[PDB]
Design a protein around this ligand. Structure first.
Ligand SMILES: *Cc1ccc([N+](=O)[O-])c(OC(=O)Cc2cccc(OC)c2)c1
Ligand SMILES: *Cc1ccc([N+](=O)[O-])c(OC(=O)Cc2cccc(OC)c2)c1
Ligand SMILES: *Cc1ccc([N+](=O)[O-])c(OC(=O)Cc2cccc(OC)c2)c1
Ligand SMILES: *Cc1ccc([N+](=O)[O-])c(OC(=O)Cc2cccc(OC)c2)c1
Ligand SMILES: *Cc1ccc([N+](=O)[O-])c(OC(=O)Cc2cccc(OC)c2)c1
Ligand SMILES: *Cc1ccc([N+](=O)[O-])c(OC(=O)Cc2cccc(OC)c2)c1
Ligand SMILES: [Cl-]
Ligand SMILES: [Cl-]
Lengths: 9, 226, 226, 9
């Protein structure tokens, strides 16, 4: 399902 | 980017993040890596955020196109293939930065684990679109990178460390979604969550907030999977 | 795109919209325009949606960077200038499609008004970033295009026609935000809204829904401006 | 304020 979103520093 | 100063590339990557210009951000951070110096913690995070956003948009588009193609002239397949090739090219670029020469120079556990987790992630994105005689080899490359990162993390970091937690989260997703190993995914997420819970008492308020945020993601997956 | 069939470019633009790949969508629709045939209503909408999304992301990034620059080394200005040049290049590409040769071949009111509204819109986006000795000339080019579209729309379309309404909405934004004419903006929005209201009785349920949606945007601006 | 959003066919 969800990996680390990881899209915001 | 060879003519721009390293510090100016880093500053421009931070501005590109604020402007939501992730392709620019990735190009600035590639230029910064190619200066040849090791990355600080904050610089590693900028590199990862930039490429995660670029490849995340490509993956979302590939999934839309793949769904239309599976429901379905040559146009949908041709355009899915175009997006797939672009996605593969971005993953190969990231993998090439890690191999030339970020991993080999990374000696501290925090940096080495971070880069090996990235290597597993970008092979996992390659595996999502793979079908030919290399799907198995791509899956094994993701597994090997995640496993080396896990082995270092278990020896060198506490069970609440956010990189260790995010590694375990993403390796559990690999097991569930790529390796057809849902029981391994569930076992890894449960053990990771339980060992982090038992270490929360050691943390400051701010570290507690960082670790519990990632633990909730492990819990969210366990809710979907059980 | 010269080697791809027109119909395949159109199909791929529709797929790129579904995949949220707006730069691809704009490139497909530029290729379709460059085949040299007139565009249907649906094809005009694909062209406009593609470029509105591309230039909308650029404008949002330019505003973020401009705000940081105004609060503020050379990096923020340099990067704002990079984004500004890219935005100008997209607007020049759209304007060049309209001038070669979409406007001159457009003889029906629906197509001619649509393209002249686009011309006003893309000069307006140029005006948003202009500062030098051409800011006045760019503003006059937007005004002239919007005014010719208004003159045709008032003669050839009912006051509820969605293109006529969207033209009036965007020309009122031009007056308020670019031309420093808030009273003209308010007068145009009020007259447009009132004349559409008085023509709603002529519409089907679906046309009523289309027109009232745009009327609500006129009302939303009047609420902000009064 | 708001021009036509215009971002969806
Ligand atoms: C691999 C990894 C593990 C843990 C963490 N973390 O501590 O957050 C990261 O870094 C990020 O996830 C960066 C991030 C933070 C908030 C939001 C977001 O995108 C929505 C990304 C990485
Ligand atoms: C600032 C900068 C330098 C170099 C490059 N580049 O690698 O070509 C970029 O790329 C981009 O930021 C964005 C981009 C450019 C072309 C195509 C594309 O595919 C959608 C994205 C930026
Ligand atoms: C076994 C287990 C351990 C830990 C957690 N957790 O840390 O939250 C969970 O959460 C769930 O699995 C919840 C669940 C129960 C029934 C159905 C379902 O799927 C819709 C989820 C579990
Ligand atoms: C499918 C296609 C053909 C041609 C072109 N093009 O005009 O270069 C594109 O462009 C894009 O879709 C996306 C893009 C490419 C490079 C840079 C960039 O800046 C962000 C966007 C597509
Ligand atoms: C004069 C006028 C005509 C029509 C409409 N409309 O079609 O909705 C309005 O709406 C408003 O101007 C509302 C308003 C009143 C006071 C303050 C304010 O700004 C916050 C808005 C007006
Ligand atoms: C210039 C113009 C006037 C009126 C209309 N319209 O009738 O909607 C359009 O077309 C669009 O606005 C396309 C559109 C529809 C829904 C959402 C959206 O982006 C959020 C765009 C154009
Ligand atoms: Cl080192
Ligand atoms: Cl004609």
């Amino acid at each position: 399902a969800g990996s680390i979103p990881g899209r915001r520093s | 980017m060879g003519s721009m100063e390293r510090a100016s590339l880093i500053q421009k990557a931070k501005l590109a993040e604020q402007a939501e210009r992730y392709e620019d951000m990735a190009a600035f951070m590639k230029g910064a890596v190619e200066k040849g110096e090791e990355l600080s913690c904050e610089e590693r995070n900028l590199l990862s955020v930039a490429y995660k956003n670029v490849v995340g948009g490509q993956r979302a588009a590939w999934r839309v196109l793949s769904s239309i193609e599976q429901k379905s002239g040559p146009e949908v397949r041709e355009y899915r293939e175009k997006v797939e090739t672009e996605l593969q090219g971005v993953c190969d670029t990231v993998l090439g930065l890690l191999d030339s020469h970020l991993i080999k120079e990374a000696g501290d556990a925090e940096s080495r684990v971070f880069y090996l987790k990235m290597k597993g992630d970008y092979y996992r994105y390659l595996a999502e679109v793979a079908t030919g005689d290399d799907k198995k080899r791509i899956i094994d490359s993701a597994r090997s990178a995640y496993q080396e990162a896990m082995d270092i993390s278990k020896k060198e970091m506490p069970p609440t460390n956010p990189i260790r937690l995010g590694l375990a989260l993403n390796f559990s997703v690999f097991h569930y979604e790529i390796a057809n190993s849902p029981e391994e995914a569930i076992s890894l997420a449960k053990t990771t969550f339980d060992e982090a819970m038992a270490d929360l008492h050691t943390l400051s308020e701010d570290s507690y907030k960082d670790s519990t945020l990632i633990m909730q993601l492990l819990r969210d997956n366990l809710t979907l999977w059980t």
